[PDB]
Structures are given as structure tokens and as C-alpha cells.
Design a protein around this ligand. Structure first.
Ligand code: PRO
Ligand code: PRO
Ligand SMILES: [Er+3]
Ligand SMILES: [Tb+3]
Ligand SMILES: [Tb+3]
Ligand SMILES: [Tb+3]
Ligand SMILES: [Y+3]
Ligand SMILES: [Y+3]
Lengths: 63, 60, 59, 63
């Protein structure tokens, strides 16, 4: 049937779009884990500095 | 004889799933854009802390 | 003595400078904890909404 | 001279050094936040790019 052939093609494209869109979302989730690993290193540089500052004032007797 | 009707029903279920997914992703996107704007504004207070520190290093 | 009084007064000013700079750093740290909380909430929302999208696709 | 004046002078030197250290800490924290900001910017640009990919997949169905 003309209409059945057309409908079958459209359904396969719809399935492909859903599958490809899920893969995009999966890649987003994985990459966000990488951004978070790098941002954990940033927090570590920052935390080291804030601890150095705290020690400075404790030691000067200013706490 | 019901092959086309089956295919049309599948098409409708798939179109509805795509629409719902699009709605979800539109919500995420729009919320993240508004969030970036709010965060930019909130970061202005950090910028202000460092301007105060600069002024201090100068007045010393 | 005169010299002791001058040194004590200078030390008060220096301590005040240190208090100010330390308080600025404490405010930065506190505000960064605000940012961390906000970002965690947005990450949780995104995760939840991606899961909802992954569910509509099941079946 | 007195023992108490020598302490005061030693305290004065340690506070001067502490001010220089505090300034260094402030500077390093500022630099790190600029780097963290650049990281977050890249994360935002990545998310925008992936959402655009998904939208274009759906637009290309033509429905
Ligand atoms: O950027 C400004 O002008 C001010 C400073 C912190 C809040 N907004
Ligand atoms: O002017 C003062 O008295 C302090 C003492 C140590 C050096 N400067
Ligand atoms: Er000592
Ligand atoms: Tb503003
Ligand atoms: Tb000593
Ligand atoms: Tb540096
Ligand atoms: Y929560
Ligand atoms: Y970039």
C-alpha cells in the first residue's frame, strides 16, 4: 500500500530520532561527570587557600 | 487489512513520545538559561568582595 | 613608653587589616557554598528530567 | 628597651608578613574563581550545543 509504505518510513525515522536523542542525553550525562571531576579539583585549590587563611588568623591569635 | 491502522497507531504513539520528550527538554533548557542569568547576577557580589580587597591593598 | 605605645597602635591597625581581609575571604567561602548548593539542585533537576525522558521511551 | 617592647616589635613584623600573605591568598582565590568561571562557561556552552543537536534532530523529521 502507498500509505503503508509511507507510514513505515515515517515510523522508522521517528524511532531513529528518539534513539539518537537518548544517545545525546546519555552523552550529556557522561560529560557532566567529567566537568564535575574538574570542578572538584577547583574546589580543592579553593579549600586549600581558605585553610591557609584560617591557619594565618588562628596563629596570629586573632581567632 | 489492519496493517495500516497498526502503523498509524504506532506513528501516533511515537509522535506523542517525541512531543513529551521535547517538552521535557524545553523545560530543562529554559530553566538552565534562567539559572545562568540568576547566577551571573549573584556572582556580582563576589566581584564586589574582590574590589573591596583591592581597595584595601591600596589604602595600606 | 612612647615607642611601645606607637608599636601597639600600629599593631592595632595591622590586626584590623588582617581581620578585614580574613572576613572578605570568609564571605567568599560562604557565598561559594551557596553556589554549590544551587548547582547541586540544578544538577538533580536535570538528572530527574532526563530520567523522565528515558522512561517515556521504555516500551 | 624592654621585653614587652621586643615582643611588640616582633608582633609588628609578623603582622606585616601576615598582611602580605593574606594579599597573596586573596589574589590566588580570585584567580581560581576566574578559572572556575571559565570552566562553568564551557559547561554551559556544551549543554547549549547538545540541546541544539537534539532540537535539530526533531526539526529534521519535518512533522
Ligand atoms: O554589580 C553590581 O553593580 C552590584 C554589586 C553586587 C550586586 N550587584
Ligand atoms: O612604628 C612602629 O612602632 C613599629 C614597630 C616595629 C616597626 N614599626
Ligand atoms: Er613568637
Ligand atoms: Tb546586576
Ligand atoms: Tb619571638
Ligand atoms: Tb597564581
Ligand atoms: Y534536592
Ligand atoms: Y568555549
Amino acid at each position: 500500500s502507498w500509505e503503508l509504505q509511507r507510514c513505515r518510513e515515517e515510523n522508522q525515522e521517528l524511532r531513529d530520532a528518539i534513539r539518537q536523542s537518548n544517545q545525546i542525553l546519555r552523552e550529556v550525562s557522561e560529560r557532566l561527570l567529567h566537568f564535575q571531576a574538574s570542578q572538584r579539583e577547583e574546589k580543592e585549590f579553593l579549600m586549600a587557600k581558605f585553610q591557609e587563611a584560617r591557619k594565618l588568623v588562628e596563629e596570629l591569635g586573632l581567632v
